[PDB]
Amino acid sequence: AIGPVADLTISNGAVSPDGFSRQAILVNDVFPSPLITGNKGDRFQLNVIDNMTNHTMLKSTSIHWHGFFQHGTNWADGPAFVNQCPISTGHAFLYDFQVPDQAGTFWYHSHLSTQYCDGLRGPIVVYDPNDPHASLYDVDDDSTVITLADWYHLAAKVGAPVPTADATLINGLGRSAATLAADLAVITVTKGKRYRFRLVSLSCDPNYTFSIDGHSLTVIEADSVNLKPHTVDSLQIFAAQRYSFVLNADQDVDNYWIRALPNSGTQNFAGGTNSAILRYDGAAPVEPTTSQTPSTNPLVESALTTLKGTAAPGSPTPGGVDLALNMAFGFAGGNFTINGASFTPPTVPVLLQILSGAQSAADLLPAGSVYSLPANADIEISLPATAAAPGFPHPFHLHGHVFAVVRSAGSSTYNYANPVYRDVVSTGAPGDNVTIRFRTDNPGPWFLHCHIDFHLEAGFAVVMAEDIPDVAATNPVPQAWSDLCPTYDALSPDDQ
Numbered sequence: 396a397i398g399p400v401a402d403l404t405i406s407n408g409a410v411s412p413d414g415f416s417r418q419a420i421l422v423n424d425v426f427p428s429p430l431i432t433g434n435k436g437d438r439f440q441l442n443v444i445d446n447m448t449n450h451t452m453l454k455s456t457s458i459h460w461h462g463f464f465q466h467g468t469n470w471a472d473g474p475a476f477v478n479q480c481p482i483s484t485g486h487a488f489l490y491d492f493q494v495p496d497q498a499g500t501f502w503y504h505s506h507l508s509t510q511y512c513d514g515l516r517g518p519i520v521v522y523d524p525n526d527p528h529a530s531l532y533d534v535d536d537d538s539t540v541i542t543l544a545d546w547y548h549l550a551a552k553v554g555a556p557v558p559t560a561d562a563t564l565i566n567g568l569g570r571s572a573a574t575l576a577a578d579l580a581v582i583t584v585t586k587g588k589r590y591r592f593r594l595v596s597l598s599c600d601p602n603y604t605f606s607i608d609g610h611s612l613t614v615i616e617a618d619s620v621n622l623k624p625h626t627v628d629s630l631q632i633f634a635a636q637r638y639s640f641v642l643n644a645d646q647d648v649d650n651y652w653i654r655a656l657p658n659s660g661t662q663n664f665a666g667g668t669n670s671a672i673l674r675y676d677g678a679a680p681v682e683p684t685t686s687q688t689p690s691t692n693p694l695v696e697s698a699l700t701t702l703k704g705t706a707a708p709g710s711p712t713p714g715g716v717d718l719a720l721n722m723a724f725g726f727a728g729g730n731f732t733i734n735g736a737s738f739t740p741p742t743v744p745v746l747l748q749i750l751s752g753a754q755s756a757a758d759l760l761p762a763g764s765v766y767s768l769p770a771n772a773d774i775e776i777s778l779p780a781t782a783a784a785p786g787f788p789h790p791f792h793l794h795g796h797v798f799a800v801v802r803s804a805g806s807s808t809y810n811y812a813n814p815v816y817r818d819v820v821s822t823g824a825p826g827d828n829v830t831i832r833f834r835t836d837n838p839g840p841w842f843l844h845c846h847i848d849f850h851l852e853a854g855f856a857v858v859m860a861e862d863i864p865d866v867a868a869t870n871p872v873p874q875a876w877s878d879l880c881p882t883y884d885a886l887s888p889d890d891q
């Protein structure tokens with residue numbers, strides 16, 4: 396409903412998405428943060444004006460446009476101390492980038508510390524005027540975007556380091572244990588019409604098992620990658636993932652529960668918690684009383700494939716690539732590690748370190764957390780799950796890229812011929828060996844990190860420094876970006 400050229404004014408104020416009032420972060424004076432849209436190939440110019448005054452939730456900010464490749468615009472990707480210094484309060488900064496060759500469902504969120512959990516996070520749709528699935532549906536608009544989010548009555552830096560959510564929000568509304576009369580989100584459909592619902596997880600932590608009573612969901616897109624249509628009766632969506640599914644509203648006129656069960660916190664639907672309402676036009680303005688039927692056809696990620704049936708990069712055998720890396724997870728001293736290193740944000744953002752002459756992974760800070768990748772190559776990364784990294788299953792997101800999921804969680808098999816491609820993948824439970832491949836077609840430093848924000852804060856990340864020698868020439872930076880670090884570094888700590 397706004398974009399692709401827009402101001403995004405960031406401020407603080409009270410919100411009560413589950414009927415409990417608490418201070419949070421507003422965007423253009425609303426919560427939840429507003430939907431941004433554009434079309435395939437568009438230039439987005441999103442001017443982020445930071446007017447936040449609350450240091451507890453951080454006055455500074457930085458925005459990641461989750462899923463966009465940012466080729467040539469690595470400085471716009473958002474992660475603080477990787478791609479930029481934070482925007483300082485009382486300042487604005489223009490993210491100006493293009494989205495060639497992508498269309499689907501995306502989202503934006505703060506990418507400073509655990510700030511997005513305090514409410515800076517909204518959906519983005521990039522429509523495709525030649526969407527290859529356009530004839531599967533009649534309606535695809537602001538009212539078919541569905542977000543899922545975890546909500547806490549204490550702010551991210553006020554509660555426990557890994558807190559448990561008070562409420563699941565669906566399109567910014569939901570109930571907690573003590574607010575069982577709070578308003579539920581309503582999604583309206585007309586009998587006989589087919590809907591492209593674009594489901595986006597804005598979660599800071601839990602994964603949701605999502606279903607709608609009485610209805611199947613025909614999944615057609617995963618994390619902005621078109622799929623062969625695959626009908627399921629439920630699906631599990633991890634933090635920062637997106638699915639488009641077609642719902643054919645061909646059931647009896649009635650209200651039907653939309654359910655989003657989290658993997659932690661309140662795990663039932665008593666009093667309408669973890670729920671929202673699918674209402675057919677003509678149905679009574681009341682809660683559903685429909686029952687859940689057992690899911691016998693859940694989404695299985697290894698069963699999904701791309702619309703094109705694209706092979707994984709490389710040759711169909713383990714290590715069949717230019718560079719293979721294994722990420723060994725651990726946890727010690729209250730910090731997560733990967734291959735023995737815990738990511739601590741460097742004072743000089745990794746992009747700036749490269750622009751200033753750093754040449755190798757050994758040169759780049761933080762030491763032990765940066766991996767140099769060769770240019771124009773195929774890469775394979777395995778991320779075996781382990782109980783040594785508590786709070787599994789951990790979803791990992793690679794910035795700047797889509798990847799082939801050659802091996803998914805809960806599967807023993809490798810698929811090089813036609814695996815799904817996406818950009819956030821669950822690394823699953825101990826015994827799994829989730830394995831991805833991608834091509835290094837995008838010079839720059841890109842975060843690879845766990846999208847449980849509470850764990851990322853705890854160091855659960857590495858940086859892929861891709862094609863270091865070409866990073867500067869590929870990503871010319873605007874002078875507003877070069878002015879971010881001196882502005883930020885001049886702040887006193889209480890103004891951060």
Ligand SMILES: *[C@@H]1O[C@H](CO)[C@@H](O[C@@H]2O[C@H](CO)[C@@H](O)[C@H](O)[C@H]2NC(C)=O)[C@H](O)[C@H]1NC(C)=O
Pocket residue numbers: 417418419449450451452548549550553554
């Ligand atoms: C800045 O934001 C923080 C976090 O939202 C607010 O913290 C509240 O602090 C009060 C007073 O101690 C507690 O009773 C609340 O439980 C805290 N809220 C949350 C959501 O954790 C703080 O009040 C905000 N500052 C101002 C001036 O509003």
Ligand SMILES: *[C@@H]1O[C@H](CO)[C@@H](O[C@@H]2O[C@H](CO)[C@@H](O)[C@H](O)[C@H]2NC(C)=O)[C@H](O)[C@H]1NC(C)=O
Pocket residue numbers: 713719720721777778779826827828
């Ligand atoms: C997860 O898969 C990776 C990749 O196949 C495994 O790491 C390989 O392990 C073999 C057997 O030791 C070595 O010969 C290769 O050098 C390893 N490759 C890399 C890139 O390190 C890893 O052992 C698997 N982990 C689990 C738990 O199955």
Ligand SMILES: [Cu+2]
Pocket residue numbers: 459461504635792846
């Ligand atoms: Cu993200």
Ligand SMILES: [Cu+2]
Pocket residue numbers: 459474506792794842844
């Ligand atoms: Cu990230």
